[PDB]
Nucleic acid binder design. Structure first.
Lengths: 553, 560, 158, 147
DNA sequence: GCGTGAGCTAATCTATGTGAGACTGATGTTAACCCTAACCC
DNA sequence: GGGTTAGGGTTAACATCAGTCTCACATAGATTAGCTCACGC
């Protein structure tokens, strides 16, 4: 449970060669590396990162052969990431004024992995390269790189300054289309030098010969990785095993393993109160002090306190021991099936819980897997869905839920989501929005809003192949809160004087719809504004925090 | 509306035939009525402990009311239900309870049926709060109280009509007794709910009293906005909507600390005490902090809330997505509800209705950036247009509006391990289909109750009325294993033979010298974490939880 | 037609004050209430400052608290029909060495100096280890994770 | 003696939100207690100065929270009616006088019209009561102040 | 220059509910260490 | 007379995570100081 990812940073004159209106590829790589390293530092994940450079004037190659291998400097070896790491990637001021072989960087990273991870346990090693593909090549390698067919858990992941989405994505527009962290529009495809073409070709051939056809989708653009969790792909640890047994009746039991799935995730670290005199937590001290009601008291001790539960207008004195004695007692973890109901009496609105489960199968023994697959296929080809009584442990409360069939071209399993209890449900009374006469919208308003929603559609039926090709999707953007917090913490740790930096531009471009949607909606938005009589500055408060008592100069 | 509290007044008969009944195991109707009132009290104190309940026996020999009237007794006045109020009522249960009532209240003493209704209106009119609803149940085992005197019947009808005009809806829960008569009679023009019924003359069973579903001991009724946000279609055109929640997790009320000697609540006082030098500290000399390895990051209190602010509170629309792109697997939080409100912006309802109509016409869902409070990071939301659905009884079950659906970020999606695809075959998928069809189920939302909450509430009831043993809740979420096994039949064994292989079962002591010798011995082996912890604690060294912490600290300090 | 066959003045104290006992509702309390009522004492509906905190024997939480009187006190006080001392029945009284270094120290000197296939999946041939070849832990765990470590060089080959 | 504590009893400590109006008059009481026989008050602490500050520059320099007017509108008549004793000035300690003057200048400068003229009135009252303590910072930006 | 009374809208202000951050402890899972059907030299 | 080949039976280490606690913020009636203006000085 410890990865070893090596970042193969590129520094070169062509790397810094840029055009107005577009960030330098070196700066884009710096942004991506800063994001990745700061996430893996401020989350305190236990894995070793190696940073190697290629293309700088100096050559500090640990092996370096007997000659050649020039202009590839190994900045740091396999170590736990430190603050100095991202400090000096922000202090790696000068891109090298030279050019080095691209494949030489790959073999340098490979030999670093081999010579630093000989006997240490590493769950999966990794090599990530952020290159330009604009340098002279060497057609003598790939006879040992490919021959090393991953007789180890090292893998490849190439990041290029291109717009690596390799389908019908012509674009080539001139509305300032490129934005770091932008979405949909990207770098103008094609218009590619007579070296980057063969560079991409041999990169594609390497990936095909390494992972297969599925490896084509494993190469990303610099702006793409700022809005995707693709750098940490093949480093993330799987959800932990949860064994149980799905039972129907009394004698029908199938060994099962429910792996965790989509669940809200928070920040692991915590803010500790510290006195502002010596920066020590030990000086601070807090404690609850229970005090009586009449004319205060000296103290009321812990041992003289008992529980109490409100019941009506008075209080009935319960106790901790009585709660433990007389309360609901289940029979440990259980995944019993109450029955089967049509997959139309449960609706997405009547869901609960902060998590979703994917009850996969038993373990590798393919005995219960056949039975579970038969059950899910019988649920899927037919209709109706299985209700389940699920309990985590003896202490955890038992909960009901639904287990929809979920069949994919790669795996087959059910999915669990909690249902509401009787007291858990709330019914409200709302006025009908269709029978009303005051708010019935006229035909002109209907047509205007129809044109509006047709203009701001976030999905194109491209190629007419009955495929709803998706525009900006929100289920792949990483939570911006964590990246913003990491940037703020890093700046405070490096510049303890400056105030909080403003939000990065690429984070803003990450969370905003593609420019085409915004542009195509201007006229419909104007028509809606001039047509709907929705104009009210009804005097109701205003957001003021600091610009009410401050000065000017 | 919001601050109004429902109110209830019972009206228990105490006639001679009301007490005497058939001589069998069936409960006397008086005991049935008292048990039902006790059940209503128990249900209404755990759920919505703010309504007013009062019980007014009529037909008694005694009399207690604001205006002196014969044969009417107000056992309790309008107030919140309480444990003492329940205990004041259970003494009338049983034959001994019947005798206690007879010696304490009496029976017979022919009444008027009008002054009782006047008295009920008196307590209804004596409340200094709002009156959301006013109801009067009339537990009676007779259907024709009068008939020998038409004047009393006319006066009762007039008073009932006056009560209905005032806004008082009475509904009698008729009690059945031996004989053949509980006919629809001089009570039909009195029931101000006027519930729809076949009105069959020859009823031969207890009336709508089992309809109570006695002791539905879990509920917390409330309706509130929970937010009032602005939906920005663009930078300049904004509409105002409210964000209600339709389904929300139910939790038992928090416990209260008590002083053992006096059994009175003790107020708590949390305050950061001195730095071992005396005094108290400011919110201005205690900055927040975090530590990563050897690097300490020191950050002020307000700057901590400053780094998690992105947008002003509101829903920033960002486009429309087809409904077929909202996968069922993705789910984080319970789905919220949006309704157009016209307090901050006038004209929001019309634009909202047009948007809803043309958004569910094209089967698309609005996509927005959601920020509920001042300093919360943005969270994308797909507003699914929920069309109003209504029953034949003109009852709304899915009110119209927009429903939030929290789309998870990529951070909130976990990755599964690789598994091998193994598919079934015919001739056992058919068997599974037969089993499933043999286990039909019409799932409903009002099906199950939280067993933990039910047990806790029953325990509280037992501890507040000394029931001498807690009521054992029938765990509704427990599978009926024997019944479903008998219903299934032998085809389960046909399944088991079909796929499962025949061999597949499916199921202190330490001191200076020993540690000085052991550090050179270098094991610190069978030495358990519980005893390393006690050694480091009783000796006074810094201690943690992981073994390596102690194994390093004790080794480095004890010798060096 | 019997059972309350003890003195009607037992649990009442010598000053005429009835002893107060608190028992949580339970099948035991069903009989204990009648037993105390016939004994002249009183049973508290809820916990009270002046009560006696009864507890059935065997309850871990009550015994750990050490502020409870066994319910057997009541039962043996009925048969004896004589009060007695309360405090007579008062409740209240490393497999570690598998670091990373030995994980490679295993394969070294065995992947070369091992010619008997019976060495694996079978005992012995750790006689060379742990006395001549030190591993500084127990000797029957190399043959428990060579099972977990029947693998290639650190993390595998494929 | 008995009021120095039992009102410092967590008006600066404690985590439970003290109600809005009980963050102005309590500080007013604490400040105005200092003009009654400063003989014993001379050895209490400097904690009152930090308490009157701290929340100032938090009630005044908060970029996340809406300022609460009836907190500093009442904390001002702290430092004012407390400066009547201990004779703080610029010659003997040119450290706290600068921030005191800056804060009162901010208080008397609203930068936006508003109802409930509470803080500015207290600002001018404090400035009028004793401006001699601001010996050298009263004549550096006299034009704007006079305006 | 200045008092003094009326109406109003801004400002609370507590009760109740909901969620985010910190925390704590029972629990079950993986794993170190050794023993055991059975044979067979 | 020692072992071999599997299947596994104790308990220690410890990582998880549901459950509980505290503090901040929302809405909804309920209630009043300030903030003006019309008069008298």
């Amino acid at each position: 449970n410890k990865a070893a990812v090596v970042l193969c940073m590129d520094v070169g004159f062509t790397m810094s060669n840029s055009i107005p209106g577009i960030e330098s590829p070196f700066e884009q790589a710096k942004k991506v590396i800063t994001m990745f390293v700061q996430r893996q530092v401020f989350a305190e994940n236990k894995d070793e990162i190696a940073l190697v450079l290629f293309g700088t004037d100096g050559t500090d190659n640990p092996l370096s052969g007997g000659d050649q291998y020039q202009n590839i400097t190994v900045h740091r070896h396999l170590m736990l990431p430190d603050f100095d790491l991202l400090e000096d990637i922000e202090s790696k001021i000068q891109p090298g004024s030279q050019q080095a072989d691209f494949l030489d960087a790959l073999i340098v990273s490979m030999d670093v992995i081999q010579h630093e991870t000989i006997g240490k346990k590493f769950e999966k090693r990794h090599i990530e390269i952020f290159t330009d593909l604009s340098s002279r090549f060497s057609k003598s390698q790939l006879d040992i790189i490919i021959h090393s067919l991953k007789k180890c858990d090292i893998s490849l992941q190439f990041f290029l300054p291109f717009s690596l989405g390799k389908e019908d994505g012509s674009g080539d527009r001139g509305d300032g289309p490129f934005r770091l962290g932008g979405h949909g529009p990207s770098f103008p495809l094609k218009g590619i030098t007579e070296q980057q073409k063969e560079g991409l070709e041999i990169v594609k051939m390497v990936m095909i010969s390494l992972e297969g056809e599925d490896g084509l989708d494993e190469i990303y653009s610099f702006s793409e990785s700022l809005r995707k969790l693709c750098v940490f792909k093949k480093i993330e640890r799987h959800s932990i095993h949860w064994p149980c047994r799905l039972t129907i009746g009394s004698n029908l039991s199938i060994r099962i393993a429910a792996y965790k799935s989509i669940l809200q995730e928070r920040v692991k670290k915590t803010w500790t109160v510290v006195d502002a005199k010596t920066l020590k937590k030990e000086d601070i001290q807090k404690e609850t002090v229970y005090c009586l009601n009449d004319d205060d008291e000296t103290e009321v001790l812990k041992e003289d306190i008992i529980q109490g539960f409100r019941y009506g207008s008075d209080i009935v004195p319960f106790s901790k021991v009585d709660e433990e004695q007389m309360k609901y007692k289940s029979e440990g973890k259980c995944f019993s099936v109450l029955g089967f109901c049509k997959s139309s009496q449960v609706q997405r609105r009547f869901f609960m819980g902060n998590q979703v489960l994917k009850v996969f199968a038993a373990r590798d023994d393919e005995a219960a897997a056949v039975a579970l697959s038969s059950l899910i296929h019988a649920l899927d080809d037919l209709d109706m869905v299985a209700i389940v009584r699920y309990a985590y442990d003896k202490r955890a409360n038992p909960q009901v839920g639904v287990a929809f069939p979920h069949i994919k071209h790669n795996y087959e399993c059910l999915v669990y989501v909690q249902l509401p209890f009787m007291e858990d449900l709330r019914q409200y009374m709302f006025s009908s929005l269709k029978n009303s006469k005051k708010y019935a919208p006229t035909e002109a308003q209907l047509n205007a809003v129809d044109a509006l929603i047709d203009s701001m559609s976030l999905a194109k039926k491209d190629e007419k192949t009955d495929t709803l090709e998706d525009l900006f999707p929100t289920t792949k953007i990483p939570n911006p809160r964590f990246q913003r917090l990491f940037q703020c913490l890093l700046h405070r740790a490096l510049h303890p004087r400056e105030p909080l930096p403003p939000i990065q531009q690429h984070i803003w471009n990450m969370l905003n719809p593609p420019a085409e949607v915004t542009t195509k909606s201007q006229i419909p938005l104007s028509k809606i504004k001039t047509l709907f009589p929705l104009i009210e500055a009804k005097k109701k408060d205003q957001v003021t925090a600091q610009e009410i008592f401050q000065d000017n100069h | 509306k919001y601050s109004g509290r429902d109110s209830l007044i019972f009206l228990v008969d105490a006639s001679k035939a009301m007490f005497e009944s058939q001589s069998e195991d069936e409960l006397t109707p008086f005991d049935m009525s008292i048990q039902c009132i006790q059940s209503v009290y128990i249900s209404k104190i755990i759920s919505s402990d703010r309504d007013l309940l009062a019980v007014v026996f009529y037909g008694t020999e005694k009399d207690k009311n604001s205006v002196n009237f014969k044969n009417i007794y107000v056992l309790q006045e309008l107030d919140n239900p309480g444990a003492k109020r329940i205990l004041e009522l259970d003494q009338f249960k049983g034959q001994q309870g019947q005798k206690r009532f007879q010696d304490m209240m009496g029976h017979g003493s022919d009444y008027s049926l009008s002054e009782v209704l006047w008295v009920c209106a008196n307590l209804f009119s004596d409340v200094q709060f709002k009156m959301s609803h006013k109801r009067i149940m009339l537990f009676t085992n007779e259907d024709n109280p009068h008939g020998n005197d038409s004047a009393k019947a006319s006066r009762a009808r007039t008073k009932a009509g006056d009560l209905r005009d005032t806004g008082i809806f009475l509904d009698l829960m008729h009690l059945k007794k031996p004989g053949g008569f509980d006919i629809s009679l001089f009570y039909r023009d009195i029931i101000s709910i006027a519930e729809d019924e076949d009105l069959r003359v020859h009823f031969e069973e207890s009336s709508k009293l089992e309809d109570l579903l006695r002791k539905v001991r879990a509920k917390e009724t409330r309706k509130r906005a929970l937010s009032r946000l602005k939906l920005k279609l663009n930078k300049d055109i904004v509409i105002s909507v409210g964000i209600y929640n339709l389904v929300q997790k139910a939790l038992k009320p928090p416990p209260i600390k008590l002083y053992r000697e006096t059994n009175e609540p003790v107020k708590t006082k949390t305050r950061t005490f001195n730095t071992s030098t005396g005094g108290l500290l400011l919110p201005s000399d205690t900055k927040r902090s975090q530590i990563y390895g050897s690097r300490q990051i020191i950050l002020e209190k307000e700057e901590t809330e400053e780094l998690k602010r992105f947008d002003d509170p509101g829903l920033m629309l960002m486009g429309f997505k087809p409904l077929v792109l909202l996968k069922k697997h993705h789910y984080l939080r319970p789905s919220l509800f949006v309704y157009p409100e016209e307090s901050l912006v006038i004209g929001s309802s019309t634009l909202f209705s047009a948007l809803l109509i043309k958004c569910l016409e094209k089967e698309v869902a609005a996509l927005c950036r959601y920020t509920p409070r001042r300093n919360i990071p943005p969270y994308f939301v797909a507003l699914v247009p929920q069309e109003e659905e209504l029953d034949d009884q003109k009852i709304q079950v899915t009110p119209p509006g927009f429903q939030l659906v929290f789309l998870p970020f990529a951070d909130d999606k976990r990755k599964m391990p690789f598994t091998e695809k193994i598919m079934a075959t015919p001739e056992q998928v058919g068997k599974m289909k037969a089993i499933v069809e043999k286990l039909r189920f019409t799932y409903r939302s009002d099906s199950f109750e939280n067993p933990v909450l039910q047990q806790h509430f029953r325990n509280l009831e037992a501890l507040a009325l000394d029931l001498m043993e807690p009521e054992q809740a029938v765990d509704l979420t427990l599978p009926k294993v024997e019944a479903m096994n008998k219903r299934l039949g032998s085809l389960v064994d046909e399944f088991k033979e079909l796929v499962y292989p025949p061999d597949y079962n499916p199921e202190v002591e330490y001191s200076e010298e020993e540690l000085k010798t052991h550090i050179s011995k270098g094991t610190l082996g069978k030495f358990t974490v519980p005893m390393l912890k006690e050694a480091c604690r009783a000796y006074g060294l810094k201690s943690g939880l992981k073994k390596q912490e102690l194994l390093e600290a004790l080794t480095k300090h004890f010798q060096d | 037609p019997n059972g309350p066959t003890h003195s009607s003045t037992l649990f009442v104290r010598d000053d005429g004050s009835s002893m107060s006992f608190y028992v949580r509702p339970s099948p035991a309390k069903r009989r204990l209430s009648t037993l105390i009522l016939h004994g002249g004492g009183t049973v508290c509906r809820v916990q009270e400052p002046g009560a006696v905190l009864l507890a059935q024997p065997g309850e871990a939480l009550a015994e750990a608290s050490g502020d409870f009187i066994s319910t057997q006190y009541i039962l043996d006080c009925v048969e004896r029909n004589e009060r007695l001392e309360l405090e007579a029945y008062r409740l209240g009284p490393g497999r570690i060495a598998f670091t990373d270094a030995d994980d490679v120290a295993i394969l070294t000197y065995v992947k070369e100096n091992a010619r008997s296939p019976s060495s694996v999946t079978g005992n012995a041939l750790w006689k060379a280890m742990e006395k001549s070849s030190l591993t500084q832990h127990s000797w029957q765990s190399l043959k428990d994770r060579y099972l977990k470590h029947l693998r290639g060089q650190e993390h595998k080959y494929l | 003696i008995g009021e120095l504590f039992s009102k410092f009893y967590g008006e600066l400590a404690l985590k439970k939100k003290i109600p809005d109006t009980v963050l102005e008059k309590v500080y007013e009481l604490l400040g105005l207690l200092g003009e009654v026989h400063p003989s014993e008050m001379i050895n209490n602490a400097e904690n009152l100065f930090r308490a009157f500050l701290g929340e100032l520059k938090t009630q005044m320099t908060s970029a996340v929270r809406e300022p609460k007017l009836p907190v500093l509108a009442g904390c001002l008549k702290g430092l004012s009616s407390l400066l009547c004793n201990f004779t703080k000035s610029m010659e003997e300690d040119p450290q706290t006088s600068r921030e005191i003057f800056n804060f009162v200048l901010k208080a008397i400068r609203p930068q936006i019209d508003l109802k409930r003229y509470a803080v500015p009135s207290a600002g001018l009252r404090l400035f009028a009561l004793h401006a001699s303590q601001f010996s050298t910072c009263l004549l550096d930006n006299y034009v704007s102040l006079f305006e």
